[PDB]
Amino acid sequence: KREHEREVIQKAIEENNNFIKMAKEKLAQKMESNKENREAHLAAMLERLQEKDKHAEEVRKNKELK
Amino acid sequence: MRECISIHVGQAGVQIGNACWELYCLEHGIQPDGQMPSDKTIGGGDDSFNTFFSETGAGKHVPRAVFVDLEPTVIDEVRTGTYRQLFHPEQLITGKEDAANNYARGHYTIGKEIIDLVLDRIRKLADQCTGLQGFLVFHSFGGGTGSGFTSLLMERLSVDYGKKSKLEFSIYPAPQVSTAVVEPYNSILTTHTTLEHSDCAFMVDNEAIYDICRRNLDIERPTYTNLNRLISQIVSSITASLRFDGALNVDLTEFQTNLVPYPRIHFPLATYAPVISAEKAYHEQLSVAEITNACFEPANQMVKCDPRHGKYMACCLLYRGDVVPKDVNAAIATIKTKRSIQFVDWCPTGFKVGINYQPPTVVPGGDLAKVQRAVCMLSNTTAIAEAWARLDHKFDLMYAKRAFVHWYVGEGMEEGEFSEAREDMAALEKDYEEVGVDSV
Amino acid sequence: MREIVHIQAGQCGNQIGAKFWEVISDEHGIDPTGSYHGDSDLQLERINVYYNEATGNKYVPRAILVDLEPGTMDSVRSGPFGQIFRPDNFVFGQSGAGNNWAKGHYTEGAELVDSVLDVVRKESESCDCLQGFQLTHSLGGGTGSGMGTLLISKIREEYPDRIMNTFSVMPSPKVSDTVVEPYNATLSVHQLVENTDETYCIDNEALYDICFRTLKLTTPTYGDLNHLVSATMSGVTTCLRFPGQLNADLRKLAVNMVPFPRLHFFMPGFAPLLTVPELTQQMFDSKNMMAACDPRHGRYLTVAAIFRGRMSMKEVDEQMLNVQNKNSSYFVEWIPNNVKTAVCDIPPRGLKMSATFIGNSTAIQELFKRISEQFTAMFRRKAFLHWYTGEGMDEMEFTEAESNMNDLVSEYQQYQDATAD
Numbered sequence: 016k017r018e019h020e021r022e023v024i025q026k027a028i029e030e031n032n033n034f035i036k037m038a039k040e041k042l043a044q045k046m047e048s049n050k051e052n053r054e055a056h057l058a059a060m061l062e063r064l065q066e067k068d069k070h071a072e073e074v075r076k077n078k079e080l081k
Numbered sequence: 082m083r084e085c086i087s088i089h090v091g092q093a094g095v096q097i098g099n100a101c102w103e104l105y106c107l108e109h110g111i112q113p114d115g116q117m118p119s120d121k122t123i124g125g126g127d128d129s130f131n132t133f134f135s136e137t138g139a140g141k142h143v144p145r146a147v148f149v150d151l152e153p154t155v156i157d158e159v160r161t162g163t164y165r166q167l168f169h170p171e172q173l174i175t176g177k178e179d180a181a182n183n184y185a186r187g188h189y190t191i192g193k194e195i196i197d198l199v200l201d202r203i204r205k206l207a208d209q210c211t212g213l214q215g216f217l218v219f220h221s222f223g224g225g226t227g228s229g230f231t232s233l234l235m236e237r238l239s240v241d242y243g244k245k246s247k248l249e250f251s252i253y254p255a256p257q258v259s260t261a262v263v264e265p266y267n268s269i270l271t272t273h274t275t276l277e278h279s280d281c282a283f284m285v286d287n288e289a290i291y292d293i294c295r296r297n298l299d300i301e302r303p304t305y306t307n308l309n310r311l312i313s314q315i316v317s318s319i320t321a322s323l324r325f326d327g328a329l330n331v332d333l334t335e336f337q338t339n340l341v342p343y344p345r346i347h348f349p350l351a352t353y354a355p356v357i358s359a360e361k362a363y364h365e366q367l368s369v370a371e372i373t374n375a376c377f378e379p380a381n382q383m384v385k386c387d388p389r390h391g392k393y394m395a396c397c398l399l400y401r402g403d404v405v406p407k408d409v410n411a412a413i414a415t416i417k418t419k420r421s422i423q424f425v426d427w428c429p430t431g432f433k434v435g436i437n438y439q440p441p442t443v444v445p446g447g448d449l450a451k452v453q454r455a456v457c458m459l460s461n462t463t464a465i466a467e468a469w470a471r472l473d474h475k476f477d478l479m480y481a482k483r484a485f486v487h488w489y490v491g492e493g494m495e496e497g498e499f500s501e502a503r504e505d506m507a508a509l510e511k512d513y514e515e516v517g518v519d520s521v
Numbered sequence: 522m523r524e525i526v527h528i529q530a531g532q533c534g535n536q537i538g539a540k541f542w543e544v545i546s547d548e549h550g551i552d553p554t555g556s557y558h559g560d561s562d563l564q565l566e567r568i569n570v571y572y573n574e575a576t577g578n579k580y581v582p583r584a585i586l587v588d589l590e591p592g593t594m595d596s597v598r599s600g601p602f603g604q605i606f607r608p609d610n611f612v613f614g615q616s617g618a619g620n621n622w623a624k625g626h627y628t629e630g631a632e633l634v635d636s637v638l639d640v641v642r643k644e645s646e647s648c649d650c651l652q653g654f655q656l657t658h659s660l661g662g663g664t665g666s667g668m669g670t671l672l673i674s675k676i677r678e679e680y681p682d683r684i685m686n687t688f689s690v691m692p693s694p695k696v697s698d699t700v701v702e703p704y705n706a707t708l709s710v711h712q713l714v715e716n717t718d719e720t721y722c723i724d725n726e727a728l729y730d731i732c733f734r735t736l737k738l739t740t741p742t743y744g745d746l747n748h749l750v751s752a753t754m755s756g757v758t759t760c761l762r763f764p765g766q767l768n769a770d771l772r773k774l775a776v777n778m779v780p781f782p783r784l785h786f787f788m789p790g791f792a793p794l795l796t797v798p799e800l801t802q803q804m805f806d807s808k809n810m811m812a813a814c815d816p817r818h819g820r821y822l823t824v825a826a827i828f829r830g831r832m833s834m835k836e837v838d839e840q841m842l843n844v845q846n847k848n849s850s851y852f853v854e855w856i857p858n859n860v861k862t863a864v865c866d867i868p869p870r871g872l873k874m875s876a877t878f879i880g881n882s883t884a885i886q887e888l889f890k891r892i893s894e895q896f897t898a899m900f901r902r903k904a905f906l907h908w909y910t911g912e913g914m915d916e917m918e919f920t921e922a923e924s925n926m927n928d929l930v931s932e933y934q935q936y937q938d939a940t941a942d
């Protein structure tokens with residue numbers, strides 16, 4: 016019965032720790048995937064805007080063939 | 082000991098915090114400068130009000146509270162308001178840019194810049210506690226900060242404070258005072274993310290409060306100030322057991338044992354009475370029986386739903402004022418014969434009663450009459466799932482078209498989080514249906 | 522502080538821009554010298570949004586005034602309040618675009634755009650917390666249209682996380698005979714669809730019809746048209762400039778008005794051109810729309826309405842709910858609570874009660890169809906295309922702008938036909 020008492024409180028400790036651990040890990044994965052998603056969204060926006068700079072210089076080079 | 086730390090997040094959480102803490106001070110005789118002449122133990126103490134107030138050596142009684150908002154407009158009014166001396170400046174935390182009604186900005190983009198500072202300031206309050214009992218979190222469902230930052234904070238609080246209890250006061254959205262079209266989105270996202278991290282949540286339907294103010298206080302067009310004065314009375318009735326003590330005072334944790342049969346079923350329905358104008362209350366004194374009977378009128382509930390068409394799992398009555406058990410028992414006996422009160426077959430039908438003897442206080446210039454006795458009913462009814470059903474339907478209408486979703490994806494969120502959140506809500510509605518079915 | 526940086530480009534942009542600063546400076550009690558002469562402290566509570574405070578209690582508009590045409594600088598300076606703008610914020614060339622979009626966007630305007638971006642940079646970097654930018658311009662000319670959209674692209678490159686708002690004046694043959702304006706507008710709409718977050722479609726066709734039919738003004742001048750524009754611009758910025766229960770800003774407006782990124786072209790409305798029932802019915806009347814579109818030819822995705830003056834908020838709430846019920850079929854069923862109402866106690870000059878309307882209606886396709894019809898009438902004949910290929914442009918860029926605008930129309934039609942069930 017003493018051995019069972021030990022196992023009950025050890026199970027209570029292990030479940031509270033496991034809940035903290037998995038909540039800690041799920042959050043870190045959520046923040047990291049969100050960071051790379053938002054960065055990729057901003058990078059795609061600038062890439063399209065930078066392709067507008069390449070097309071603009073191309074338009075000027077064509078007029079320079081005046 | 083058993084201190085409680087209050088956390089007020091976003092405009093709704095902050096402004097309701099203003100109303101609650103002003104009401105607390107009037108209830109305990111605390112002046113706007115924090116001095117409490119009746120308190121003879123200078124610089125400390127173990128009294129019931131010390132669960133919500135710490136004390137400085139100069140005799141100031143300081144709320145165990147943190148105010149957080151991602152923009153400074155609302156908390157700036159606290160910093161320059163009537164009770165500015167009550168709070169140490171580090172208890173009032175503001176950013177520069179709000180979440181713009183966007184859960185993703187409150188949880189990820191903007192919220193992540195301030196979360197560590199907020200947790201540091203919370204730890205400062207927790208370190209002043211000799212027996213910290215848990216947290217009370219005030220926030221809206223619909224705001225980007227109230228939804229996004231709160232759920233981020235609740236996740237971090239579970240990590241930093243193991244399974245220490247966390248209670249919510251959550252403002253459920255209503256069109257009459259809505260601020261954003263995407264409030265159903267924010268509500269479902271924060272309810273899903275917070276569900277595992279909250280032990281008990283008291284939802285407050287702004288439409289229910291709006292209607293009570295119109296119908297009972299004869300207020301033509303209620304403002305936030307009208308709503309918050311009523312809400313603070315209901316919050317005070319719920320926390321009264323933590324801040325006062327007496328021989329018939331049942332602690333809130335003891336009510337929670339009865340109110341939460343399964344961890345996910347932790348949303349009690351609050352019903353409060355009486356809400357009466359000073360002109361109506363004059364010469365009309367409402368008895369224990371009358372205010373108790375009013376607890377079973379759906380018009381007095383904090384969230385719109387019909388418990389007459391659901392089943393009860395718990396019924397708690399929290400009385401304050403001139404109330405004795407004999408009158409409570411007779412009132413309950415009458416109500417049971419004459420009302421539609423059906424319990425599930427796996428729960429006892431008895432009503433848990435708490436009585437706090439100090440009568441309700443009203444803030445000067447309000448619309449509520451001062452009354453000799455009031456009661457707040459906390460019931461666990463399957464009918465509260467109606468609030469989820471209405472919210473989930475509004476979510477479905479927009480999400481079927483992916484309307485406004487790009488504002489969330491642009492902040493790094495994925496559609497999978499929307500559908501994962503919505504599936505959790507679908508399981509929650511199913512849970513409430515299952516608990517109501519008879520045993521086999 | 523949530524600052525907005527205002528930019529006005531070209532003749533039309535500088536004209537409606539100057540009137541905007543005149544109107545709101547009066548509303549905030551700012552005189553032409555930048556000194557405050559005010560009754561209420563509601564006038565100064567959110568004054569950061571459009572004004573910088575220099576030492577000495579002087580308020581200077583956070584405004585950048587730009588044109589390839591030198592004359593407009595002097596006309597701005599000589600106009601009322603010309604003496605409030607920062608002189609370093611005047612950026613002008615010597616060329617003039619001659620209603621040539623390619624000159625504004627690719628050649629002469631690109632030569633001047635870096636000089637403007639430097640002014641944008643001092644102003645943006647002084648900002649406590651920048652909301653974003655609001656540009657005034659026309660789409661029918663060359664500078665405001667071509668250089669305006671080039672500026673939008675360049676600003677978005679350096680401020681990709683700020684809101685880009687435009688007041689875009691659409692061309693109409695009733696006010697302008699210049700032939701190539703359907704080209705300039707289509708090329709501009711091509712840019713605006715991709716690179717702005719919210720665009721107010723200020724339609725010269727609608728402005729003319731209101732002055733002629735409703736106000737009975739034959740031969741309406743630009744002062745008559747811009748009188749409607751300044752009333753509109755004051756109304757749709759009221760919730761940015763004054764403290765309200767809604768506490769509006771450019772991002773919150775976009776989040777709530779724009780369900781899909783490309784469908785960000787708003788129909789403004791104003792009333793009166795009175796009881797609260799009259800205001801609400803007029804505000805939803807097609808005659809009061811600043812875009813020549815009939816709302817009953819489409820459906821509202823979202824609506825924002827601001828009522829100004831001393832009136833019963835209960836009565837306003839009842840009437841707004843009433844027009845939604847009696848016109849249910851003209852609001853989409855799959856966006857709940859898509860009509861929002863706000864109130865401001867301070868009325869504009871000369872009225873005790875006014876109402877301003879911001880609609881995201883699928884009927885806006887009527888505006889783009891009208892421009893598409895005029896565009897294709899010329900493009901099928903290749904008329905005056907040498908003005909554009911002469912600046913180095915390739916002719917299928919015209920193909921793409923037309924195709925992109927036709928896509929915008931079809932997308933508005935798609936959500937007009939969508940149902941909840």
Ligand SMILES: Nc1nc2c(ncn2[C@@H]2O[C@H](COP(=O)(O)OP(=O)(O)OP(=O)(O)O)[C@@H](O)[C@H]2O)c(=O)[nH]1
Nearest residue numbers: 091092093096179180182221224225226227258305
């Ligand atoms: N009862 C009550 N509800 C409020 C109050 N203030 C805001 N709300 C409600 O809260 C919702 C909007 O969320 P807010 O709390 O204002 O937004 P927020 O938390 O500051 O988040 P942001 O988007 O960053 O501003 C709406 O449904 C409002 O009706 C208040 O003082 N009392």
Ligand SMILES: Nc1nc2c(ncn2[C@@H]2O[C@H](COP(=O)(O)OP(=O)(O)OP(=O)(O)O)[C@@H](O)[C@H]2O)c(=O)[nH]1
Nearest residue numbers: 531532533536618619620659661662663664665697
């Ligand atoms: N409502 C209104 N429209 C105007 C005003 N001024 C010009 N427009 C319209 O603007 C269009 C032409 O654009 P402009 O602004 O005049 O040309 P710009 O932007 O200065 O560019 P360039 O003159 O070619 O260098 C025409 O269709 C006019 O009808 C104005 O003051 N009010």
Ligand SMILES: COc1cc(C(=O)c2c[nH]c(-c3cccc4[nH]ccc34)n2)cc(OC)c1OC
Nearest residue numbers: 260261262760769773774777825827859861863
């Ligand atoms: C109401 O009027 C205005 C609002 C706003 C605004 O930021 C906002 C926030 N929510 C909303 C909004 C819009 C549409 C449907 C909605 N259902 C719930 C909220 C909401 N709109 C900005 C304005 O002018 C700049 C303005 O004036 C016209």
Ligand SMILES: [Ca+2]
Nearest residue numbers: 120122125126
């Ligand atoms: Ca003490």
Ligand SMILES: [Mg+2]
Nearest residue numbers: 091092179226
């Ligand atoms: Mg806020």
